[PDB]
Design a protein around this nucleic acid. Structure first.
Ligand SMILES: [Mn+2]
Ligand SMILES: [Mn+2]
Ligand SMILES: [Mn+2]
Ligand SMILES: [Mn+2]
Ligand SMILES: [Mn+2]
Ligand SMILES: [Mn+2]
Ligand code: NA
Length: 326
DNA sequence: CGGCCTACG
DNA sequence: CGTAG
DNA sequence: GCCG
């Protein structure tokens, strides 16, 4: 079992859901306590289990696996022997975990903001609404649309959104293209949001494109919330039969020279991409982001035509999007 | 010991 | 700080 | 929490 998540296929459907979900509760809780390091280990351990070919049924089957030490192994052992891990159950039933989960699920609220509100005694979404001067415009919008934003986005919704985004993009710039990214490109059937990557085959034509797209969507009444720029984190008013629902949509523009890097980054998964960037720097001495792959000694950028080109330059076997579900 | 992804809004 | 994957 |  390779140690980096970008070195192994991780399918959407796997065989150790109960174990991985327990480890991911401890990872989320570690984040709520401000330990990115513990979060990362528990996330990595959970991800190792997603890549295994069969169910883990005995603790023996963990020996030698990367990112399993004393703590993650004891969690699995308790689950195998008893069906529950006391530590996991204490976290999941705790007021702190439940409230931090509630608050950080709001668009515009992260751990540091949620932790301050917790320390101030706040506990419910109505507590926040009762104190609106304490909110940014982004948080106001997240709270206003929280019910809709908690409803899974379905493929039906994606296809409708892709059509209205394609229409606005075509109106703003002939020849520009729209590519579905994020979890739906990895094969997920549901999501929290929809992610789109926009480019144009002639380098430089996409300059100024995203404000033009946003103006065109807003004039069609499709935008509930937004705000030169190249990433827009929007809330769309998606028509439904007789009505509408709020949906989170991310729109990203990249020049075509950067498109393989942006496609790779925005397709995820989040852990897959952090692991790939770590691998690139720590194992290959190259710096990776959604704009390019930089050799800091030659001070040159790798010219990629495809995602496959990037994997090859990093010495990695290519994984299609549906195997990046780390 | 000390790192843990690397950007944009 | 928030957002993204 | 795990590991280079
Ligand atoms: Mn026991
Ligand atoms: Mn997404
Ligand atoms: Mn840029
Ligand atoms: Mn230390
Ligand atoms: Mn994400
Ligand atoms: Mn520690
Ligand atoms: Na949030």
């Amino acid at each position: 079992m390779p140690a980096y998540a970008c070195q192994r296929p991780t399918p959407l459907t796997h065989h150790n859901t109960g174990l991985s979900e327990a480890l991911e509760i401890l990872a989320e809780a570690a984040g709520f306590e401000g330990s990115e390091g513990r979060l990362l280990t528990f996330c990595r351990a959970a991800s190792v289990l997603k890549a295994l070919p069969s169910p883990v049924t005995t603790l023996s089957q963990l020996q030698g696996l990367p990112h399993f030490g004393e703590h993650s192994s004891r969690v699995v052992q308790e689950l195998l022997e008893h069906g529950v891990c006391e530590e996991v159950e204490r976290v999941r039933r705790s007021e702190r975990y439940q409230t931090m989960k509630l608050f950080t699920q709001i668009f515009g609220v992260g751990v540091k903001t949620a932790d301050r509100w917790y320390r101030e005694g706040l506990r419910t979404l109505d507590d926040l609404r009762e104190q609106p001067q304490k909110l940014t415009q982004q948080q106001k919008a997240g709270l206003q649309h929280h019910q809709d934003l908690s409803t899974p986005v379905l493929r039906s919704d994606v296809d409708a959104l892709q059509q209205v985004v394609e229409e606005a993009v075509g109106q703003a710039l002939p020849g520009a293209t729209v590519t579905l990214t994020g979890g739906f490109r990895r094969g997920k059937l549901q999501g929290h949001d929809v992610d789109f990557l926009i480019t144009h085959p002639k380098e430089g034509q996409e300059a100024g494109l995203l404000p033009r797209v946003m103006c065109r969507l807003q004039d069609q009444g499709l935008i509930l919330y937004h705000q030169a720029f190249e990433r827009s984190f929007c809330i769309f008013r998606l028509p439904q039969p007789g009505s509408w629902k709020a949906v989170r949509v991310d729109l990203v523009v990249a020049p075509v020279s950067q498109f393989p890097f942006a496609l790779l980054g925005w397709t995820g998964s989040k852990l897959f991409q952090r692991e790939l960037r770590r691998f690139s720097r720590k194992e290959k001495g190259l710096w990776l982001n959604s704009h390019g792959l930089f050799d800091p000694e030659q001070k040159t950028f790798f010219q990629a035509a495809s995602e496959e080109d990037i994997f090859r330059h990093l010495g990695l076997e290519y994984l299609p999007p549906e195997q990046r579900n780390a």
